[PDB]
């Protein structure tokens, strides 16, 4: 009884790999007639993927294959410090076709014909390898539907109408974008839409190749982004989210216990939770401005404070040993019993706790889906990538977040018009986020999304049937 194998090729890096495995197990646990091969690409300096890959146990219907090139080849692929990433992924094209002939599930025997490619956004170069075997490719976007509508619009502005999108940079003119109810102010656009860099022209070349695929799985659900989703036509969109990994309870549990044990002592829906994603940090004078707003607000707070990278290079934000380096004098011993300052945080464990009632966030989409899965309203303080669009959508389109400052951009090169958001903006945003008990109407819809996000994944839900339709078309390639 033959099955169908899907060749998952996520963009390199843990996070993309973890999201690819999450959606892979959703397909395997839904339909017995499918196996999946995840192809891992590893960068040289990526501790974490190396740490995470070693923990991978190959399920009987799920094989994790590592296909990276020898270091001789990879080293010769740093030639362009802004075309590295597209060059690196393309560099694995010959080792992908080798996997198809040797290590894949094909040649039979549980064993079955190859059936499709599910590629990440940065892996559109793999569409051509899938066509050498006369087999359709797919896209799995861990971003949302509104960002796909934004990519289609700016791909059209750049390649079809040949518009120089630099004009919209920090502008006050409002754009009409398919999938956005109200005009989009230019100053809220992600930098990838206005920056004329090398990386963005190669990124929008990948958006042009979205049209060659059979389908696109987006990490959202129909009731969350209804206007953005119904503006997308080619190709067929499958909202299968919210896809999210709760299982990795690890930051291991001993420090989470103290954080959880402390939140257990706080009143319910009373603590506003500070966190800014994997690479989010702040400069000395901005952390200063946050401590004043937190004290001046009067609410309980769990603040995740990480230490910045050296700015030369040097990987991700770290952790402090003591926050005597960072914090204003007396703030620590004055927020005794009301506030706590940590480094890396068990985000899902914190957001699921009943004491947390507000989530100030950079609006990274995985973080947003985690907050909405537990009904926690958001304070929007975006930093990088598409987060400025996530913020504008959550604040102005979905009524699910209060603005801290939507036109904020964290500059890694050492680009923005605003350096410091003030404690007066932070406290006023926090004051509005936790206000009015549970008659806060932004909090009211956050409650609703928790029920709708849970309903979308169970049988009968929009994401459940949409995922069921994705599998049917995948097996329709094999018949
Ligand atoms: O202090 C932190 C910051 C982030 N995360 C986790 O890291 C991911 C961040 O998601 P996001 O979409 O924001 O990705 P990013 O924007 O960080 O690249 C989520 O799964 C969070 O649970 C965490 O556990 N602790
Ligand atoms: Cl967690």
Residue numbers in the entry: 2 to 110, 112 to 252, 256 to 419, 421 to 485
Reproduce passages from the article:
Here, we identify five lycibarbarspermidine glycosyltransferases, LbUGT1-5, which are the first phenolamide-type glycosyltransferases and catalyze regioselective glycosylation of dicaffeoylspermidines to form structurally diverse lycibarbarspermidines in wolfberry. LbUGT1 and LbUGT3 are the first phenolamide-type glycosyltransferases with crystal structures, and both exhibit a canonical GT-B fold consisting of two Rossmann-like fold (β/α/β) domains in the N and C-termini. The N-terminal domain (residues 1–242 and 467–485 in LbUGT1, residues 1–246 and 464–482 in LbUGT3) is mainly involved in the binding of sugar acceptor, while the C-terminal domain (residues 243–466 in LbGT1, residues 247–463 in LbGT3) is responsible for the binding of sugar donor.
